[PDB]
Amino acid sequence: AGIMRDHIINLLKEGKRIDDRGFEDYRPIEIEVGVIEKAEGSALVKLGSTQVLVGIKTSLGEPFPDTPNMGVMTTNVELVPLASPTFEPGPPDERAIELARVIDRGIRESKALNLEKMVIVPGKIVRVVFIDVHVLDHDGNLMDAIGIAAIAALLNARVPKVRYNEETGEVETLDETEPLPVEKIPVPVTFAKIGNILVVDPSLDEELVMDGKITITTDETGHISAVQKSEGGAFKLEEVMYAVETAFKKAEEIRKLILEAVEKAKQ
Amino acid sequence: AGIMRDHIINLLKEGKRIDDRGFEDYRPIEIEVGVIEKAEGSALVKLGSTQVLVGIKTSLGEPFPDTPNMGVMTTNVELVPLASPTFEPGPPDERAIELARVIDRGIRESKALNLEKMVIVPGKIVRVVFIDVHVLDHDGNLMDAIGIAAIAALLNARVPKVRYNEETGEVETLDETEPLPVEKIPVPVTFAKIGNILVVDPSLDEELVMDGKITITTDETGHISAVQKSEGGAFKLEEVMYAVETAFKKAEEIRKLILEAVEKAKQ
Amino acid sequence: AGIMRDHIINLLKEGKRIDDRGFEDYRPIEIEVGVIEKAEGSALVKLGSTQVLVGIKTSLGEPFPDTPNMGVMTTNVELVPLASPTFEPGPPDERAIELARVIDRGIRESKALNLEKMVIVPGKIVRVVFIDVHVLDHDGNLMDAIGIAAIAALLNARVPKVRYNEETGEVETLDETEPLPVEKIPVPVTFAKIGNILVVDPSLDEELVMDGKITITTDETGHISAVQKSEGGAFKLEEVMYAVETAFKKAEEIRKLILEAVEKAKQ
Amino acid sequence: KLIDENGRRIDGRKKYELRPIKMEVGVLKNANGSAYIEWGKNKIIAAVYGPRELHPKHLQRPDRAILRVRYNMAPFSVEERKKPGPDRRSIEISKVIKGALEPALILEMFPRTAIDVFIEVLQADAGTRVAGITAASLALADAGIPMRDLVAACAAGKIEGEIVLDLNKEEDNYGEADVPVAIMPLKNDITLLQMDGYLTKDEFIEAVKLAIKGAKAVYQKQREALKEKYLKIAQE
Amino acid sequence: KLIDENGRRIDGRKKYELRPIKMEVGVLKNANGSAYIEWGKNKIIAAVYGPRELHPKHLQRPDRAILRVRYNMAPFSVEERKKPGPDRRSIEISKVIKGALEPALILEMFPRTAIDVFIEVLQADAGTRVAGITAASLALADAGIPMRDLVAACAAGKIEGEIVLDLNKEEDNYGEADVPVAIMPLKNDITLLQMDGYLTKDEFIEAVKLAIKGAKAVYQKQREALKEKYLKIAQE
Amino acid sequence: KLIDENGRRIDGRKKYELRPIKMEVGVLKNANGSAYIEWGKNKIIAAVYGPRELHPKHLQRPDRAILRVRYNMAPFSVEERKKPGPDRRSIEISKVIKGALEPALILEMFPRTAIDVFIEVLQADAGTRVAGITAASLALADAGIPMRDLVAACAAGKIEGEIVLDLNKEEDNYGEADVPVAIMPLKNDITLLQMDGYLTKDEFIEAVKLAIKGAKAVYQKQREALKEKYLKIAQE
Numbered sequence A, B, C: 001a002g003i004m005r006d007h008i009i010n011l012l013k014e015g016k017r018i019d020d021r022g023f024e025d026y027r028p029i030e031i032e033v034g035v036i037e038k039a040e041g042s043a044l045v046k047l048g049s050t051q052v053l054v055g056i057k058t059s060l061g062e063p064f065p066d067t068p069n070m071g072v073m074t075t076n077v078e079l080v081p082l083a084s085p086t087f088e089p090g091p092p093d094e095r096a097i098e099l100a101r102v103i104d105r106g107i108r109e110s111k112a113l114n115l116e117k118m119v120i121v122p123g124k125i126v127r128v129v130f131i132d133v134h135v136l137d138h139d140g141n142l143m144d145a146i147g148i149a150a151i152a153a154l155l156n157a158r159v160p161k162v163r164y165n166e167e168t169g170e171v172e173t174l175d176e177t178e179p180l181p182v183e184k185i186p187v188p189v190t191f192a193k194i195g196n197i198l199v200v201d202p203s204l205d206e207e208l209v210m211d212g213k214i215t216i217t218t219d220e221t222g223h224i225s226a227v228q229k230s231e232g233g234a235f236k237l238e239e240v241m242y243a244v245e246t247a248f249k250k251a252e253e254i255r256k257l258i259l260e261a262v263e264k265a266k267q
Numbered sequence D, E, F: 001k002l003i004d005e006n007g008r009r010i011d012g013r014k015k016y017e018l019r020p021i022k023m024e025v026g027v028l029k030n031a032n033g034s035a036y037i038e039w040g041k042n043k044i045i046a047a048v049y050g051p052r053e054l055h056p057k058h059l060q061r062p063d064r065a066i067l068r069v070r071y072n073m074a075p076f077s078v079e080e081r082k083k084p085g086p087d088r089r090s091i092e093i094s095k096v097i098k099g100a101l102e103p104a105l106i107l108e109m110f111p112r113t114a115i116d117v118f119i120e121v122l123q124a125d126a127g128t129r130v131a132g133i134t135a136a137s138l139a140l141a142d143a144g145i146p147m148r149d150l151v152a153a154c155a156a157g158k159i160e161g162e163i164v165l166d167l168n169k170e171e172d173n174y175g176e177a178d179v180p181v182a183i184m185p186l187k188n189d190i191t192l193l194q195m196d197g198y199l200t201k202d203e204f205i206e207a208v209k210l211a212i213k214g215a216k217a218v219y220q221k222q223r224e225a226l227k228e229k230y231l232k233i234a235q236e
């Protein structure tokens, strides 16, 4: 398949991609939230044939020593052997680690999940949010698909109302649910640089020939909460400038779909 | 050694086995309990040249959150590299896991070790039983040899009398010992299906050519507390019916030896 | 490089070594303490081109159940892949384990770090000393270089004064520092036996052809707190006698350098 | 404490009724074969690869393909979040699933190769190993792998004295026995048989028989899901 | 709570000033190449091996050398002792360092081989990944490896509203953004770019630009450290 | 607090007396060689394999067999249950046992091969590494492996001021020094020597000498156990 760099490269030169997308088009997007009923939150996301499932699970626990003020958020990506022949049984490899870390960071750094509004008793009892990413099919652009599924799944989440009883000192978990304090919708927008052209949402085939990849995660307030150039290759400042700008625009188109899918599920 | 399937298969056809056993005979059995003095309980079991040592070790600890009513029982099988060339250094493989799990289950599910009679203080202090299986020589039928050694070693066990002092709130461990609440004697009986014949207690050589293997664990009250078809192959309902019936009869012959060895050791 | 056993062996026969050292000479020694400011203690040690960095880090913690009377000391050796092509990424191999264990033992068994003088509150709050060995370049005789760096780094250590407040029950960590209770200076002296000659401080090249190696760790009071014959080969009693004697003399020459480097750093 | 409400079950089912079951083949681009199964509250994907290159020759078998199965539960699949990674349970189910699928496969046809089966439990509810074996055959059939039969699987149990078909979480948790069975239906060959619990011989045997009836039912859904697959390539 | 004291920083530095930086090449006998860097309170060694024999052929690439980077922090390098062993952070930095160095290397020149880069952080203080990439190029250059350029690296950030050059621990901990950049200076090719924090587009971009200026400064120290190397073999 | 009761020991032994020692060769069907040792309260099996195929060629040595030793303690072997798995102690003893047995073996005779020695401690009581080395030579001799000598091993110590032979658990725990020695008796070659504790030179040396006498005693039991082996094949 080194035959295929040449093909993809020459097609680009003629302004085309292998599946007839523009350089700024995403493949068809399917977002569906609420799909794992037993989870507190969930989302199934398809970027073309790329499929990822996120589950939100919450429990109550101790906060971290240094932040007794804050609830806990933790992101794990499983690159399941079933998703890809390049995925192997065992602990996260660096791909799984870097995707997890970048998706967490865009959320955390935007305070998209407001950890301060997750305290039950300061220093002792906080809500602990597990964002558990399950990659079901890898056909390109896990970064975006993952970040999409994760924020979509936070917004889907309904966690049980918890009450701290003052007379008893105890913490009552009520049957009534409520949303998580999700206050922003960060969305990663990823570009493949192949030669001298950047292309949004690369498929597998484009990732196999790209030089390098850059992810810009933006929210609806026009801020950036994560940038990650990944793999090899090099970018020009202006390609970086271009990517930042284009990302905000793709992020708003995607945020809108995230929002519909979120609402379609409370019906 | 694919020469040897043919030989074993043809011998079976003529109603014979390689060591002249009937299809329902066990190889000579040696049970000896009390062999690791420093352990709370122990048993050395030989099924022919198959040798396994079980140790019982007990301590006091916390029960599981969900069962504050119950003492703790935990079963581990070490397939030591010394036992076999097929055994490797490292964490249990699936063979070690499946043997451990099946032997535990036959015991636990029969309540052969009565976990309710192992509480010191409900929700806080219970007895914790380690059944630690050490396979010394693998020459076939670890499943039976393991289950035999384990129940033999529970019955051998003498654990220190423990006292909860009410004035002091503390738990006194006395020098006086007592048996564990062992109320049943489940024994696994394992068959190898080789072609269309089932054979009890397969040797190594028979396991190397068998299609599949089925274990039925029964106690003296005529109940079954575990069934496990293992490896490949398929069984017919009536082969299953046959195995269940034959197992109860082999289990009683074996239970009797378990009992003698238990008594021979209190002299 | 089996060419090189012959060369080294024949040179020995003529009373020489490859770098013109006597059989009892060390390569040039560089000791420098205080090099990782953020650590509580540290030492960089060069035995020739062999380079090792030790860091001392302390915290407060629980003592071990059985020793509520004693502070905690723990020694870890990292054989970093950067140090050698024979070093690999992952958990200590047996080389890293055996060096760690021997260096700890010479210190612990001499009570060079007096663990009894590290209690804050008996049974509850003790000082915990991490001796963290970082091997930067392996060119022979890690054992000595490690033990040198470690004791040099204990003597360099300044840990915060801790106060147990009696009215409050609490433990105040003061800004004022103090040394660790270091009461002896054990130093390992290692010999390579190559043929029938023992040679102190073997280089890499001598370790590649030696038969075996023996380490004798002695302190300034004329006691031995660890002996370790390592690798293969065999020693004669008198070679052992010789090594013990020579070790005390090399240990005093080295102890003196340890001491200068310790003082040069409080200026 | 009530599992048969006279004499129906908690979810309204009769002693020998199945939870609703939906299966679909060819759901993943990358696998050589796939199936998705919703069996009551269970949601499971099966992926197959390939026959593919086995590494290294050490692991290579000279006259046959080896079968490698990994059963795994997503952290979000269970009521209390599961740390990811195989545990002892998963290791064991992997093994027994392997043993359930092996007899159905003609391994001597692809020597020196591995056929990898991945069973991912996305939502669990009891019967995951049987729902997994059921979807893992469809997925093998999906990958164009030659097979002597499909492997159909179903569990029976004993709750409040009674032998019943296809436990849910509650009945399994609180019941008296769980008897998963897997079979190759055409010839009545049992490729999986486990019992966890406490049964008389005659109760064990009725359970085995009952589960074999539900496995045969599940077998007709497997054929139907495969028939559905060839109605989709017969366009056109 | 004060990081610019009007409008200087805690350590006395101006908004676009560097911490003191000292680099040295060829510090280890055994590595094919090495560099030591003291960058503020950071003390980092980089070691390179070789191009060397890759094991096994499975891992071997036919037309090129592979680059393997391991970034690691000594337990004593951080204020609160770090248990040894990679963690998620280290794994990620390893990956991104790899990605920062790869474009600079002509891998097709040593096929079937591995070039191993070890970055050991002996004292950390913020900017370890950039100080690591800076010393890892010198070390590659030290090992006689052909390279299209050196890779120079530096971080910018935003603290108390302001875009600033080269954070220390305190400013990173308590600041608003940390933007490491790595470049191949001669052609202005960015080989590392990360942002952690919260920035407007125009703040992101000024940070990228600022860090590129400090990376170019660091690049002149790299050349100088290499010039120093050939003044030392020119004896004689 | 009393280890010499004037001047006998806790178990009745004199300063230079051995605990009872029983050894037997050829106790396992599957190993190429085996020995069982009861040395006081110690119960240890040694198994040997083979010379056997080393995997892969990477691990293969061209001119010789490699020796691989694994020393391990069963969880039930110690007063407080040991989680299974090597620990740092076991790793170290494995290494030093390896070093004790290697000089005795003519490895150049089976090139490209591994000889695997497994020492399993079923009951421990002090002196397990020496009882292990003693049974591991018999087991190597049992596997028909050519050896320059047997390796005999025994420990001496210092308890309550006095140099004594062959510590038990209590004396080791509470004594002042433990000096295991292993030798090839015929030529007086020390293949294991460790000291844990605190000794003068003259106390170290008397201990080494004392342990060498007990190792020579143990050596006569090894020969006797081997003589017993050839009285058993001389039937007939």
Ligand SMILES: Nc1ncnc2c1ncn2[C@@H]1O[C@H](COP(=O)(O)OP(=O)(O)O)[C@@H](O)[C@H]1O
Binding pocket: D078, D079, D080, D082, D089, D124, D125, D126, D127, D128, D129, D130, D169, D172, D178
């Ligand atoms: N680790 C776990 N945590 C929570 N629930 C579990 C876990 N493992 C299994 N369960 C629940 O118990 C059910 C039945 O378990 P079991 O009989 O062991 O497997 P199967 O799903 O094959 O019946 C599972 O489907 C699942 O709902």
Ligand SMILES: Nc1ncnc2c1ncn2[C@@H]1O[C@H](COP(=O)(O)OP(=O)(O)O)[C@@H](O)[C@H]1O
Binding pocket: E078, E079, E080, E082, E089, E124, E125, E126, E127, E128, E129, E130, E169, E172, E178
């Ligand atoms: N595990 C750790 N423990 C304590 N401090 C740490 C740890 N990891 C990082 N730090 C501190 O935070 C600083 C900045 O972190 P970060 O931005 O993550 O990496 P970099 O060093 O590349 O800036 C590090 O240099 C270090 O001083």
Ligand SMILES: Nc1ncnc2c1ncn2[C@@H]1O[C@H](COP(=O)(O)OP(=O)(O)O)[C@@H](O)[C@H]1O
Binding pocket: F078, F079, F080, F082, F089, F124, F125, F126, F127, F128, F129, F130, F169, F172, F178
């Ligand atoms: N992990 C352990 N748990 C409990 N006791 C142990 C453990 N390890 C060793 N011991 C006891 O200490 C004894 C002496 O230890 P040591 O000198 O370290 O080894 P050796 O058995 O060679 O003398 C051992 O035989 C054993 O009885």
